Design a protein around this ligand. Structure first.
Ligand code: SAH
Ligand code: ZN
Lengths: 176, 300, 352, 179, 107
């Protein structure tokens, strides 16, 4: 699945393979223009080059948010800090979970029957924490806000590396 | 530890201005705001003479190195220069456009710092009586000024709560002490090493400052520090007591290793605002405001 | 900072200043005037401290003591008197043979001073009485001999009127080292004045043919008696041919400064590398008399017909002392600040 | 004399700069040369061309100490180039501290801070009768906020521009609303 | 008989010294050319050439260029005060003028 042309953070290091985001110095958040509306859309994020001293806050955000909003600013954006697993949501800092390894296959998912929610930290099918609950309905483009210029890829295939086991999803060969 | 009253030196016709010992440590003369400066003793209250010849009020009075030549911070924009052994009104310092509250000397005893209510700290002389330089420090009137131990640094205590430290050679700021609250700083002084300053601000919370870094170290609790320019002193004759004025008919004297409530003197009938210690003896000066008009020398 | 660069005022108060010298600490500067007036200033606040109108006669030499209290007089009637910074009174008085050029105390005792006439060997006295110790010099032909102590107080280096150096002991006259320098081609020439540093044992040779040589106070002791050392650094000038009048050192043995005698100039070399690095100037047609380096800060005092100029680095004012949280930048400084978006030790207050 | 526990003992000001005084084509920057040639000499002029002293409009104003001719640059307004949602956190923070907002934007994606880091270019009041304006240039992509002039300006005048609350300018056709 | 270090780097310079001393001998400026006068003169020429090439290269970068064409030398000489007072009567080839329109001509 290809990425966006205009709905992106412009000054980031755009890689030519069209499946890899490379960052800058600072929290300028790219929102790739293919995200959920209803039901289910699951994809994985393969990680190629994750050097240390990075805050890879990953999660969900809306097109209402700023492009310069770090992911973890408001009630719409979520947060997952590297150091001491801390959540930063509605500007609330509470040391939540532990850190995370290097070189796995990441990937998040929301389960909403058309609402009953699965907003839970997902990593190779291993839970790191139940994140939040009961969002409103809108558009949720995936949001990437990085601290270094780390080479990280993305996956869209049906044959996942480590999916959530017994997952209700939809393939990315329909709307992307 | 057993300070006992020897003599009560009353007689001031108006509010007692300040008690200041002699720098060589033999006098305790006391002045008042009645435009009259008397010459009292320190051990029995030995009286010499009363200075007359001012035009308006008196905030601060000073001394010499031999404890004879005098000057007072007069409230007619002047600083009339006086003497004990001759009594002649020596000179009169103009150059003010507002009232004058405090003045002091370098230890070389030939310069006059002038932190007045015109808010620009000038630098005056004794031999020539000449305004050398100007420190336009604050937009608030000066509460106190002080040189350091040798005569090389001037602290700026003002209403806004900025305890800056000023150069003497060419006269520039070196550092600005800051605080979240905005208390009026009343009266601070340096340490015998020049690296500590006890803060006396109008917030009912004293502070002691690490000078070389810029942090607070040891404080006090349970004290009335609200209204006027409340003075603070040192004590090394007994313990490491901290002699300070008090508004509740007491004299705030406690130790700084202990930081407790261990000794409370009493007997005054108004707000005690000026205290000082004799440099060697166990003599603590004390003189409250207008409704007391007495001097209580509690001697150990 | 380093070596001075800019003019920075003067003190043109006292008429007809002639000589100047410092203490150990760098806060005392007496000036023997053209009529016996001895004036001290301040340095931190720069006020005139004490005029000592001692003699009716002019003064040509002075020296400070180790305690910071005692001075020494040298008038045109050979009067050597002990003074004090508390009283300022006359103690001693007697007449030498007519010339007296320069005196120097012993460093580690204020008992003894080393006094130098023109046409005689230098003589060491005490301050208890008029005892004098006769010092022997090798030539004893012209008797135009200069002498000075070293830094720590081990020996006495002497310089004859012919170009040979003797190294004697302060009491027993132990000739332990000597050397003759190969002065050019044929003529070996005399020595004007030898001065000594404060860190180490380096010193300088000031000849009468306008060449400065650099030596150490250990290499000559290693070479022993009648050795041939080499100059550690040669210093000279070629363009204006540059006669010299006064020599001294920098703060901790870093640089070497030497005032001139013709063009009212100050030159700053390097003892480390060995090249000239800055030329100073001033009034074009005056006459340089005495140059003193300041021991704990880069200040140079130069007397040229009363005027004492103080080259003092030209400090530059700025912000960030007013508001120490605001940093006055130069260009665009963009960044993000936070990656994560939101004991009873008794220290003496009287530690004197 | 020791009887006045009197008010006005609070400042609420980190800038106590205000003192008693408050005194109110030969070159390169007025040529027709290309822009970075003037941009070099910009900093050699702006460090000593102007001054900051007390004004009757709002505290401290900008009285220049050189007779500026029309058309040339004066000074650059530079600081922390902030990015667009830290603006709101700093609005809440300086609302909590009580110090006004100093934020000019280069574009509508990146703003420039002045309170934390900057220069002496902060002392430019808004007025509805200006004599200066603003253009952004391209010094190798690293754009800037540099202020030109409009007319012939003499020694002792305040410099203002339009920022685009009742204003304290008193213009002949004043808008009195800064939105 | 050993190696011979030149007089161009014995003083730490760049302009030659033997060529300058030959041009002071082969010119009949005087009889006897002194000791270090060509060294002094070569240092002076170095200083002037560095002074003009600094401004030349700076303007060459600021016109988005990499080589240097003589318009840059024209600008670098005629902008400064001191070099304009020295090089009074000199026409640089391909030079051009400085932009100067009077006050009363433009509307
Ligand atoms: N016409 C006006 N009158 C008063 N304040 C104004 C104004 N126009 C703008 N302002 C506000 O005032 C600020 C100008 S800063 C004023 C100068 C400086 N702070 C001083 O010490 O006086 C701007 O941040 C703006 O928010
Ligand atoms: Zn207005």
């Amino acid at each position: 699945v290809l990425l966006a042309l205009h709905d992106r953070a412009p000054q980031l290091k755009i890689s030519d393979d069209r499946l890899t985001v490379v960052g800058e110095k600072g929290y300028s958040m790219v929102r790739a223009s293919h995200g959920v509306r209803k039901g289910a859309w699951y994809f994985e994020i393969t990680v190629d080059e994750m050097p240390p001293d990075t805050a890879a806050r990953l999660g969900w955000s809306q097109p209402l948010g700023n492009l310069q909003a770090p992911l973890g600013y408001d009630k719409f954006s979520y947060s997952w800090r590297s150091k001491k697993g801390t959540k930063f949501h509605q500007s609330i800092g509470k040391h939540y979970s532990s850190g995370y390894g290097q070189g796995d296959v990441l990937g998040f998912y929301i389960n909403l029957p058309e609402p009953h929610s699965e907003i839970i930290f997902y990593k190779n099918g291993v839970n790191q924490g139940v994140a939040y609950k009961d969002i409103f309905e809108g558009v949720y483009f995936p949001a990437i806000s990085l601290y270094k210029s780390c080479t990280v890829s993305i996956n869209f295939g049906p044959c996942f590396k480590y999916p959530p086991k017994d997952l209700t999803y939809r393939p990315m060969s329909d709307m992307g | 530890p057993n300070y006992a009253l020897k003599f009560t030196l009353a007689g001031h016709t108006k509010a007692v201005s300040s008690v200041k010992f002699s720098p060589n440590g033999e006098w305790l003369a006391s002045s008042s705001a009645d435009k009259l400066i008397k010459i009292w003793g320190a051990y029995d209250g030995k009286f010499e003479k009363t200075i007359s010849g001012h035009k308006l009020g008196i905030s601060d009075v000073a001394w010499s190195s031999d404890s004879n030549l005098l000057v007072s911070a007069s409230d007619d924009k002047t600083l009339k220069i006086w003497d004990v052994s001759s009594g002649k009104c020596l000179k009169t310092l103009k150059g003010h456009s507002n009232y004058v509250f405090c003045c002091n000397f370098n230890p070389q005893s030939n310069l006059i710092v002038s932190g007045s209510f015109d808010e620009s700290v000038r630098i005056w002389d004794v031999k020539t009586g000449k305004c050398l330089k100007t420190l336009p420090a604050h937009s608030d009137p000066v509460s106190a000024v002080h040189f350091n131990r040798d005569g090389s640094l001037i602290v700026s205590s003002s209403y806004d709560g900025l305890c800056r430290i000023w150069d003497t050679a060419s006269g520039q700021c070196l550092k600005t002490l800051i605080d979240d609250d905005n208390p009026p700083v009343s009266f601070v002084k340096f340490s015998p090493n020049g690296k500590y300053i006890l803060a006396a601000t109008l917030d009912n919370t004293l502070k002691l400052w690490d000078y070389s870094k810029g942090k607070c170290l040891k404080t006090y609790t349970g004290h009335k520090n609200e209204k006027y320019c409340i003075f603070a002193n040192f004590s090394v004759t007994g313990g490491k007591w901290i002699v300070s004025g008090s508004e509740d008919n007491l004299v705030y004297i406690w130790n700084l290793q202990t930081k407790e409530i261990v000794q409370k003197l009493q007997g005054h009938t108004d707000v005690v605002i000026s205290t000082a210690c004799h440099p060697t003896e166990n003599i603590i000066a004390s003189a409250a405001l207008e409704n007391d008009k007495t001097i209580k020398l509690w001697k150990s | 900072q380093n070596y001075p660069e800019e003019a920075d005022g003067t003190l043109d108060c006292i008429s007809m200043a002639l000589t100047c010298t410092f203490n150990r600490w760098g806060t005392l500067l007496a000036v023997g005037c053209n009529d016996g007036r001895i004036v001290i200033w301040d340095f931190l606040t720069r006020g005139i401290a004490k005029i000592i109108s001692a003699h009716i006669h002019p003064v040509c030499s002075l020296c400070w003591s180790r305690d910071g209290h005692k001075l020494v007089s040298a008038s045109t009637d050979n009067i050597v008197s002990q003074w004090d910074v508390l009283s300022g009174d006359c103690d001693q008085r007697f007449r030498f043979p007519s010339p007296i050029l320069k005196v120097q105390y012993h460093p580690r005792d204020q008992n003894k001073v080393l006094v130098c006439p023109m046409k005689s060997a230098p003589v060491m006295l005490t301050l208890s009485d008029s005892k004098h110790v006769v010092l022997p010099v090798d030539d004893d032909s012209d008797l135009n001999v200069v002498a000075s102590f070293d830094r720590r107080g081990e020996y006495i280096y002497t310089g004859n009127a012919k170009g040979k150096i003797l190294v004697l002991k302060t009491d027993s006259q132990d000739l332990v080292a000597s050397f003759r320098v190969t002065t050019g081609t044929s003529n070996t020439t005399a020595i004007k004045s030898i001065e000594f540093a404060r860190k180490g044992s380096c010193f300088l040779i000031n000849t009468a043919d306008r060449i400065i040589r650099v030596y150490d106070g250990r290499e000559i002791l290693t070479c022993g008696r009648d050795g041939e050392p080499e100059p550690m650094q040669k210093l000279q000038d070629l363009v204006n041919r540059t006669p010299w009048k006064k020599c001294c050192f920098s703060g901790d043995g870093e640089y070497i400064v030497a005032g001139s005698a013709r063009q009212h100039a100050l030159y700053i070399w390097e003892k480390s590398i060995g090249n000239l690095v800055k030329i100073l100037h001033g009034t074009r047609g005056e006459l340089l008399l005495d140059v003193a380096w300041h021991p704990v800060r880069p200040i140079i005092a130069s007397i040229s017909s009363g005027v004492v100029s103080i080259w003092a680095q030209n400090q530059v004012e700025n912000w960030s002392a007013f508001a120490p949280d605001f940093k006055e930048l130069d260009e665009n400084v963009e960044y993000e600040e936070r990656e994560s978006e939101f004991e009873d030790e008794e220290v003496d207050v009287t530690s004197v | 004399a020791r009887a006045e526990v009197h008010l006005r003992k609070s400042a609420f000001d980190m800038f106590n700069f205000l003192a008693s005084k408050h005194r109110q084509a030969r070159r390169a920057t007025s040529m027709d040369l290309p822009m970075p040639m003037r941009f070099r000499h910009l900093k050699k002029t702006s460090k000593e061309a102007v001054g900051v002293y007390r004004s009757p409009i709002h505290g401290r104003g900008l009285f220049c100490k050189r007779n500026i001719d029309a058309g040339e640059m004066v000074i650059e307004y530079a600081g922390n180039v902030i990015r667009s949602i830290q603006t709101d956190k700093r609005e809440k923070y300086y609302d909590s501290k009580g110090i006004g907002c100093y934020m000019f934007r280069i574009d509508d994606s990146e703003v420039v801070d002045a309170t934390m880091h900057g220069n002496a270019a902060r002392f430019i009041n808004h007025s509805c009768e200006p004599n200066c304006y603003s253009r952004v240039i391209n010094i190798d992509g690293q754009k800037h906020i540099v202020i030109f002039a409009m007319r012939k300006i003499y020694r002792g005048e305040e410099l203002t521009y339009d920022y685009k609350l009742p204003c304290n300018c008193g213009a002949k056709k004043c808008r009195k609303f800064l939105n | 008989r050993a190696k011979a270090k030149t007089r161009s780097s014995r003083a730490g310079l760049q302009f030659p010294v033997g060529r300058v001393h030959r041009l002071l001998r082969k010119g009949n400026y005087a009889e006897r050319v002194g000791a270090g006068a060509p060294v002094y003169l070569a240092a002076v020429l170095e200083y002037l050439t560095a002074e003009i090439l600094e401004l030349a290269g700076n303007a060459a970068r600021d016109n988005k260029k990499t080589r240097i064409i003589p318009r840059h030398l024209q600008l670098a000489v005629r902008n400064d005060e001191e070099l304009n007072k020295l090089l009074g009567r000199v026409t640089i080839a391909q030079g051009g003028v400085l932009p100067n329109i009077q006050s009363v001509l433009l509307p």
